[PDB]
Amino acid sequence: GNKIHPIGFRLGITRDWESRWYAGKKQYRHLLLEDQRIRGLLEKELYSAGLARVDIERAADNVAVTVHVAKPGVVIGRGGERIRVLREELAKLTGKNVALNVQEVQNPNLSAPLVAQRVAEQIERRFAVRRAIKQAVQRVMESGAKGAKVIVSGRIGGAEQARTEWAAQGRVPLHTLRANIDYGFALARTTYGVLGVKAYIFLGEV
Amino acid sequence: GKGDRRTRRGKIWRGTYGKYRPR
Amino acid sequence: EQYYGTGRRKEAVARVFLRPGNGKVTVNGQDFNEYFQGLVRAVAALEPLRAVDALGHFDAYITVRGGGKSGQIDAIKLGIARALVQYNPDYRAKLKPLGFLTRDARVVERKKYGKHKARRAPQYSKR
Amino acid sequence: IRIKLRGFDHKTLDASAQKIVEAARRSGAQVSGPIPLPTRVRRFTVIRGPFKHKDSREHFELRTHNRLVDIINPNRKTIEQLMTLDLPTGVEIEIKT
Amino acid sequence: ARRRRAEVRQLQPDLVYGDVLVTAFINKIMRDGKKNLAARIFYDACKIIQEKTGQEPLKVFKQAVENVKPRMEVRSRRVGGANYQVPMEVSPRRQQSLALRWLVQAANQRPERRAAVRIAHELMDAAEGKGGAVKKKEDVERMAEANRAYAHYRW
Amino acid sequence: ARIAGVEIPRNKRVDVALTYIYGIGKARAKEALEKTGINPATRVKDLTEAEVVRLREYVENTWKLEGELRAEVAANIKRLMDIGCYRGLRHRRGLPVRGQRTRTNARTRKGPRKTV
Amino acid sequence: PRSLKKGVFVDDHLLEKVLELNAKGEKRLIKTWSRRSTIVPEMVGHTIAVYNGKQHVPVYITENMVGHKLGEFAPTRTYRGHG
Amino acid sequence: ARKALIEKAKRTPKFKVRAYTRCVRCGRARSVYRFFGLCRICLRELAHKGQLPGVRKASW
RNA sequence: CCGGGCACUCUAACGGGACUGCCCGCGAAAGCGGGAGGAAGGAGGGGACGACGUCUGGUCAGCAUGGCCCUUACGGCCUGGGCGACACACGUGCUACAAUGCCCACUACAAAGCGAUGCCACCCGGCAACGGGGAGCUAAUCGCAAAAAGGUGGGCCCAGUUCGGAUUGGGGUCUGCAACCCGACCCCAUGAAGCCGGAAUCGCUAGUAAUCGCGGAUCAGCCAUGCCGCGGUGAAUACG
Ligand SMILES: [Mg+2]
Ligand SMILES: [Mg+2]
Ligand SMILES: [Mg+2]
Ligand SMILES: [Mg+2]
Ligand SMILES: [Mg+2]
Ligand SMILES: [Mg+2]
Ligand SMILES: [Mg+2]
Ligand SMILES: [Mg+2]
Ligand SMILES: [Mg+2]
Ligand SMILES: [Mg+2]
Ligand SMILES: [Mg+2]
Ligand SMILES: [Mg+2]
Ligand SMILES: [Mg+2]
Ligand SMILES: [Mg+2]
Ligand SMILES: [Mg+2]
Ligand SMILES: [Mg+2]
Ligand SMILES: [Mg+2]
Ligand SMILES: [Mg+2]
Ligand SMILES: [Mg+2]
Ligand SMILES: [Mg+2]
Ligand SMILES: [Mg+2]
Ligand SMILES: [Mg+2]
Ligand SMILES: [Mg+2]
Ligand SMILES: [Mg+2]
Ligand SMILES: [Mg+2]
Ligand SMILES: [Mg+2]
Ligand SMILES: [Mg+2]
Ligand SMILES: [Mg+2]
Ligand SMILES: [Mg+2]
Ligand SMILES: [Mg+2]
Ligand SMILES: [Mg+2]
Ligand SMILES: [Mg+2]
Ligand SMILES: [Mg+2]
Ligand SMILES: [Mg+2]
Ligand SMILES: [Mg+2]
Ligand SMILES: [Mg+2]
Ligand SMILES: [Zn+2]
C-alpha cells in the first residue's frame, strides 16, 4: 500500500476546500469541531438523499452550509418542509445562524463519492461485485467522462480469502496535478465484515 | 567541554545560565 | 557620482556604492579592514577591481545584511563587479572570464526526514 | 484608516485588497497602496502510517498571509461605501486610526 | 564512478601567494571546516621557513612538494588465488594528492608542540630530502620497484 | 605536607596548586587568594614564607579538609545506610544512587562487567 | 528538593492522626498510603505501616530519620540478586 | 479501558496537573495537536480530505 | 532619531527567462562533443510525487469492522506501586581522550520560527537556579534573543593535566495537590573510566561530508544527548 490520497494532493490546484474560512489560533479547534458534528449530523441523515459534498463558510457567529446532493427533493421535503426541519435541529447543535442551502448535482455519475456509495450499497445486497464495478465504470464513461477507475477490497462475495478487485477505462493520470480527478470512498457493511469501495473519476485536464 | 556544567561552553550546551554563563 | 550593484551570497545581501577618490572602502558603517580583520578571505572581496586595474580610483560605501562574514564577502565581490559594468559597460570583458559577473546559486540544502542532515543517513547494523 | 487583511488564501486576499483599494481611491481621496506583509507559517510533521514506520513522515502547513492598506486622505465619502463591501469568507478585516 | 570520468575541481587561488597548489595544502590542514585556522598555521609556517632559513617560502614549499611525489606505487589486484601488489605509475593528479596528504600527515607525527611549527619543519626537511613524508615516498617507490615482475598485470 | 596536609605542586600557579588539596576546587582557590591578598598567577616555588603561613592558616581554619571531610562523607553515608533508607540501600549494594537506569551502563558504581 | 519558600509537606490527614495519638496516649500501628509524606519530629517514637503498592511495612521512626520521606523506608522492589 | 477513558478525559480533574488532551475525534491519548484538537492520524486524514481550512501539503 | 523619499534592501503576489534556441563538428534520425551569448545550458540545485504487484509484511492498541470470548466482571472507580528492576547481552546516540586544543575577558556576522493565567524588555535582592517589581506587543512595531564556531587579547605548557565530566557528599531554586521510589536546574566539595579503540562495521560525490549554534512540535515541569527544521564556516576524492 503506497499511493497517496488524490484529494489532498490537489488542494489549491484542481480541488478546493470543503470548509472555506479563516480563524485565529484560539478558535480553529472549536469551529472545526462543529464542522465535524455538522457533517456528522448531515452525512448521517442525508445519505438517503445522496450526499456529495458539505461545503461550509463562516464570518462572525454565523455559517452558510452549501450542501450538494443529487435528489434535492429528499432535502427540500414537502413544499420547503424538510429544508427547515433540519435547520432547527442543525441550529440546535450549532446554536447560531445556520444558513442551510441545497445545491444541484448536474451529473450524479460524475460525482465520485456518489458512484462509490452506489456500488458499496449494491454489494451489501449480495450483488455480483465483478459485474457491479464493470457497470459503474461503464455508466461513468457514458456520462461523457474522460476517465474512470473503481476498486473494491475485502471478503468479496463472502470468501474467507480476502481479495482486492479493480476496474478502469480511458485515462486516469494520478501523477498529474492539472488533471482534475474526483475521488470518493464508501464503506459497505455486511454480515461477514467490512468491504471498502474507492472511486476515481477523471473530469478533465486544465 | 560541552558536558562540563562549570564552563561557558557547558551551559551553552545545556541551554542554561548561572555564575559561569550569566546574562 | 555614484555606481551601484546588488551582491548576494546564500543568505547575505550587499548594497555597494562606488564613488571616485583615493581608494577608501567601507562596509556597514565600518572600515573594510576593520569589519574584516583576521579573515584572510576578505582580500577577495576587493578582487574584481584588480581585473580592470581600478584599485584606488574608486571609494566604496557598502552595507551588508544576512549570511555570514565570508558569505557577505562574496556578495561584496559581486556588487563591486556589478557596479563596474554600470560605470563601464565595456568592462564586460576581462571580468567575465574571471566569472566575477555571476552569482553562484549554491545554498544550504534542506534537511530531510529520515536523515540526520540533508544526506547523512543514520548508521545501521543487520546481524 | 488602517485596513489589515488576514487570510488562509492570498488569491482572495490580493483580490479583496484590490476591491478595497479600488473603492476608497474612487470615492475620495488618498489610499496608500496594498503592502504584502510577511506570511506566518504553522508547519506540522506527522508519521505517514498509524503504527511504527518512524522514518516516513508527511509535511503539512497553514499559511496565514497578511496584507495592509491605508487611506491617507479619509473623509466620510468612503466611510459608508466601505461599510458596503462584499467580503469573501476566507478573510478577516481590521480597522484603525 | 560508473558513468563518466568526473571533473577535477580547481581551487580559488590563495590571497598571499596567488597559488592553486598552496590552496590545496591549506585544505588538507583544515579540520571541521575551519579554513581560517588552517590559513594561519600555513602562513605562519611561511613565516617560520623564512626566519630559520632566509629564502622564499613558496620556493621552500613547492620544492618540498616535488621531493614527496611518488613516481610509482603498488595497487593490489588479487589475480588467481593470491593478492598481487601490481606496480603502477602515478598520474600527476594523484602524485600531487599523495604528496600533500603525506606531507601534512608527516607533519602531525613530529614532536614539536605548535601546528605552525610542524608544518614549517616538515616543509623545511622535505626540500632538503628528509622528513617522514619523503620516507613514505621512498617506501612506496621501492615497493613498486620490488614488484617489477608484475608489470604485465597493469591497468 | 605543607598546606594543608598535602604538599602542593611547585612550579605551578598557586591557584591551581590548591585544587590538588582535598576539599578545595578552583572556586575556593579564587577565594583564598583575595582573602589573603596573594597573586594567583605566581608559582608556589615563588611564594614568600609570609604568603605561605597566611594562606595555610586561613584555609585550615575556614574549611574542613582531607581526613575530616572524608570522615563526614563517610559518616553521612554510614547513617543513610544504617537508618534503612533507599539512599542507604544503594550504598549497601553499591548500585547507582541518583535514580539512573541500571539495565545498561552504571559501570562506575558497579565496576567492570561480569559477563554471563 | 521541595522549595524552601513553600512548607514542609505532610498530607495533613496523616499529620492529624499523629497528634491525636500523642495526646490520647500513644501508640498503635498506623496504616498509611502517604509515601510522599515527610517524616516529622512529632512522628518520632511511633511505628507506621507504609504501603509500597503491595504491603504495609512496619517502620519504627527515630531521631536520625526526620528529614526523609516515609517511602524511603518502605522498599518498592523485590530483589534477592541474580542467578 | 477505552470508553470510560474517553469520558474521563472530558470531565474536570481533582487537580490541574491531571488534565491531558485526547483526540477530540478518535480518543487517541498520544500525539495530540492542541491547535486542531486532533491526533496526527486524524490530522492526516482530514487534511487529505480538504476538510481542514488552509491546510495543504508543504514543499521546499 | 525627525523632515522627507520607495531609491535601495526586503516583503509577497504576478510575470519573464532555458527551448541544445544559436555557431563549429560527428550524425540516417534521435542525439553527442566543443563555442558563444547569458544569472543560469543541456532535467540549473532541492522538494512534492511511488506502476501492475511482492513480502499470507506491519497495525483488532488510533479508528472502523466479521466472528469468537467475559457479565457484582476479562466491566468500572480510587489510593499506592510498576512501566525507571540489573549477575548480563545487542542496536542507535551524547560527551571525550586534548595544544588545528582547553579556559577567562573584550568584539563581531545568521536563518527559521514561536509567543494574552503568553513571550517577557529594563529595574532592583541573590555568586547563581531564581525571586519582586515593571515597559511594550493580539506582534516586519514588542519579546524570546546571546547566534556559536569566527575575531582581538591574556593564561595553561604535554602531565590522567586548567584534558575529560562520570560518580558521590552537602546547601539550595522551580514546576506541580505531591519530586522516597522517580523530574530538571543552580552553587560548594568529590574529579571515575578514558592516551583514539580486537574481530568486525556505517555514512557521505559540493555547499555535500565534517564542524558550530538556533528554533518548533508534544509539553505544568522534565529525564530531548530523540525527532522535524534553519542558517554559519566549509573539504578530500572518483584511475576504473
Ligand atoms: Mg573541565
Ligand atoms: Mg586583514
Ligand atoms: Mg546545515
Ligand atoms: Mg533499522
Ligand atoms: Mg530515526
Ligand atoms: Mg604517511
Ligand atoms: Mg581538590
Ligand atoms: Mg535520571
Ligand atoms: Mg533505576
Ligand atoms: Mg481496566
Ligand atoms: Mg471503544
Ligand atoms: Mg500532564
Ligand atoms: Mg497529549
Ligand atoms: Mg517599486
Ligand atoms: Mg550533454
Ligand atoms: Mg513525476
Ligand atoms: Mg502474518
Ligand atoms: Mg481496534
Ligand atoms: Mg474484532
Ligand atoms: Mg509510578
Ligand atoms: Mg518503556
Ligand atoms: Mg541519544
Ligand atoms: Mg560525536
Ligand atoms: Mg585523578
Ligand atoms: Mg587510566
Ligand atoms: Mg582534571
Ligand atoms: Mg544530595
Ligand atoms: Mg521525581
Ligand atoms: Mg598525552
Ligand atoms: Mg577526534
Ligand atoms: Mg569507537
Ligand atoms: Mg549521488
Ligand atoms: Mg568540538
Ligand atoms: Mg537544540
Ligand atoms: Mg516551544
Ligand atoms: Mg515544557
Ligand atoms: Zn485521532
From Swiss-Prot, chain A:
GO terms for cellular component: cytosolic small ribosomal subunit. GO terms for molecular function: mRNA binding; rRNA binding; structural constituent of ribosome. Coiled coil: none annotated. Keywords: Ribonucleoprotein, Ribosomal protein, RNA-binding, rRNA-binding. SMART domains: KH. Residues 39-107 form the KH type-2 domain. CDD domains: KH-II_30S_S3 (cd02412). InterPro entries: KH_dom, KH_dom-like_a/b, KH_dom_type_2, KH_sf_prok-type, Ribosomal_S3_C_sf, Ribosomal_uS3_bac-typ, Ribosomal_uS3_C, Ribosomal_uS3_CS. It comes from the Bacteria. Pfam families: KH_2 (PF07650), Ribosomal_S3_C (PF00189). GO terms for biological process: translation. Belongs to the universal ribosomal protein uS3 family. Binds the lower part of the 30S subunit head. Binds mRNA in the 70S ribosome, positioning it for translation. Part of the 30S ribosomal subunit. Forms a tight complex with proteins S10 and S14. NCBIfam families: rpsC_bact. This is Small ribosomal subunit protein uS3. It comes from Thermus thermophilus (strain ATCC BAA-163 / DSM 7039 / HB27).
From Swiss-Prot, chain C:
One of its GO terms (biological process) is translation. Keywords: Ribonucleoprotein, Ribosomal protein, RNA-binding, rRNA-binding, tRNA-binding. One of its GO terms (cellular component) is cytosolic small ribosomal subunit. GO terms for molecular function: rRNA binding; structural constituent of ribosome; tRNA binding. InterPro entries: Ribosomal_Su5_D2-typ_SF (IPR020568), Ribosomal_uS9 (IPR000754), Ribosomal_uS9_bac/plastid (IPR023035), Ribosomal_uS9_CS (IPR020574), Ribsml_uS5_D2-typ_fold_subgr (IPR014721). Belongs to the universal ribosomal protein uS9 family. Part of the 30S ribosomal subunit. Contacts proteins S7 and S10. Part of the top of the head of the 30S subunit. The C-terminal region penetrates the head emerging in the P-site where it contacts tRNA. This is Small ribosomal subunit protein uS9. It comes from Thermus thermophilus (strain ATCC 27634 / DSM 579 / HB8). The lineage of its organism: Bacteria, Thermotogati, Deinococcota, Deinococci, Thermales.
Curated annotation (Swiss-Prot), chain F:
It comes from the Bacteria. Residues 94-116 are annotated as: Disordered. GO terms for cellular component: cytosol; small ribosomal subunit. It holds the Pfam family Ribosomal_S13. GO terms for molecular function: rRNA binding; structural constituent of ribosome; tRNA binding. Keywords: Ribonucleoprotein, Ribosomal protein, RNA-binding, rRNA-binding, tRNA-binding. One of its GO terms (biological process) is translation. Part of the 30S ribosomal subunit. Forms a loose heterodimer with protein S19. Forms two bridges to the 50S subunit in the 70S ribosome. Located at the top of the head of the 30S subunit, it contacts several helices of the 16S rRNA. In the 70S ribosome it contacts the 23S rRNA (bridge B1a) and protein L5 of the 50S subunit (bridge B1b), connecting the 2 subunits; these bridges are implicated in subunit movement. Contacts the tRNAs in the A and P-sites. Belongs to the universal ribosomal protein uS13 family. This is Small ribosomal subunit protein uS13. It comes from Thermus thermophilus (strain ATCC BAA-163 / DSM 7039 / HB27). The gene is rpsM.
Swiss-Prot record, chain H:
The keyword Ribosomal protein applies. Its cofactor is Zn(2+). Zn(2+) binds at residues 23, 26, 39, 42. InterPro entries: Ribosomal_uS14 (IPR001209), Ribosomal_uS14_bact (IPR023053), Ribosomal_uS14_CS (IPR018271), Ribosomal_uS14_sf (IPR043140). GO terms for molecular function: rRNA binding; structural constituent of ribosome; zinc ion binding. GO terms for biological process: translation. Binds 16S rRNA, required for the assembly of 30S particles and may also be responsible for determining the conformation of the 16S rRNA at the A site. This is Small ribosomal subunit protein uS14.
